[PDB]
Design a protein around this ligand. Structure first.
Ligand code: 37R
Ligand code: 37R
Length: 329
């Protein structure tokens, strides 16, 4: 058919995320996919974040919370079973982010809630007490496809993210509602059905649900390998950075932490972390700092030898250099 419907029966965040990843990069862009899942207690971090800084790893071990690193940039989110997650994927040029949005909107209204889009990534429900945000989401796009992933708040414990994150000095000095409040009784199963029907209605087509779990791996290419990597401690946590120097700042487009050693006046190793949505140029910068003379003018030279390779991140990259120029010497 033209449709693939995947329902996870597993609360394993590394399995669920593994599926979202295969859908986006492993699957062919021939079909249209809806994946619905939920996670047990998990902190999800952007791919370039330092969880040893971002997260209270000790409290996470105690209270039994998993850490998962996603392949996209950005900052950290907390998930419990009170979150219902979705991902839509469709090949281009026929796909756009309005389609998935309209489907979730459809399901929410069908469920009994007066919902509409607020800006790009948010869905809000209209209330006499005002707009309530019930859903966050993110969009990822390719030459051949677009993907829309997000979470709905059914009965999430909203006081939990604080327990599992460390205070970020420079970030601080730089509404949200559960559906069970509006629909007492709402459940994961009901939301999944409603989104599924709205999915089928829009496309004018019906497929059977492919129920998937680790006990029973899904019909996806290179999944075994993707799952093995996603659930690996080396990927999610990785070794903590142990460097002598640290340059850090909080910009409007993300925090940056530049760790490095200096020996004989030159950088002998470096590592960058960020919650930026586009870490790639920061990664490239770290690569170019290897062996660099530890001097302001020099840090700029390497940081502007990339501007040509990262046109879309021009502004940022120069908030960067102008920062290294005043932060070093
Ligand atoms: N609220 C924040 O600080 C998030 C900033 C980054 C935005 C972003 C978030 C997510 C994202 C992409 C993205 O660009 O993908 C996600 C996948 C997931 O399973 C669970 C959670 C996420 N979250
Ligand atoms: C509100 C917190 C929040 C949660 C998510 C988010 C953003 C955000 O701000 O983006 C997401 C993307 C996704 O694929 C799957 C799940 C999510 N979850």
């Amino acid at each position: 058919s033209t449709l693939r419907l995947l329902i996870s029966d597993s609360y394993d965040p590394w399995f669920n995320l593994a599926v979202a990843e295969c859908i986006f990069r492993q699957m062919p862009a021939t079909q249209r996919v809806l994946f619905l899942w939920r996670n047990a207690d998990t902190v999800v971090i952007g791919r370039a974040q330092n969880p040893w800084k971002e997260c209270n790893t000790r409290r996470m071990e105690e209270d039994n919370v998993r850490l998962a690193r996603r392949s996209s940039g950005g900052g950290a989110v907390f998930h419990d079973l009170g979150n219902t997650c979705f991902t839509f994927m469709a090949g281009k040029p026929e796909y756009d982010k309005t389609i998935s949005t309209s489907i979730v909107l459809n399901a929410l209204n069908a469920l009994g809630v007066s919902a509409e889009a607020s800006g790009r990534n948010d869905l809000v429900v209209k209330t006499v007490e005002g707009d309530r945000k019930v859903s966050g989401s993110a969009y990822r796009e390719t030459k051949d496809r677009g993907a829309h992933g997000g979470t709905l708040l059914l009965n999430a414990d909203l006081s939990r993210l604080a327990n599992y994150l460390n205070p970020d000095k420079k970030k601080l000095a730089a509404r949200v509602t559960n559906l069970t409040e509006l629909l007492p009784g709402i459940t994961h199963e009901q939301v999944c059905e409603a989104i599924t029907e709205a999915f089928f209605a829009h496309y004018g087509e019906r497929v059977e649900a492919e129920i998937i779990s680790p006990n029973k791996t899904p019909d996806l290419p290179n999944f075994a390998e993707t799952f093995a990597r996603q659930s690996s401690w080396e990927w999610n946590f990785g070794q903590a950075p142990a460097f002598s120097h640290l340059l850090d700042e909080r910009f409007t487009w993300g925090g940056v932490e530049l760790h490095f050693d200096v020996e004989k006046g030159h950088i002998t190793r470096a590592q960058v972390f960020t919650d930026s949505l586009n870490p790639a140029p920061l990664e490239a910068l770290a690569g170019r700092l290897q062996g660099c003379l530890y001097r302001a003018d020099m840090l700029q030279q390497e940081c502007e030898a990339l501007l040509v390779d990262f046109p879309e991140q021009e502004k940022e990259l120069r908030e960067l250099s102008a920062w290294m120029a005043g932060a070093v010497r």
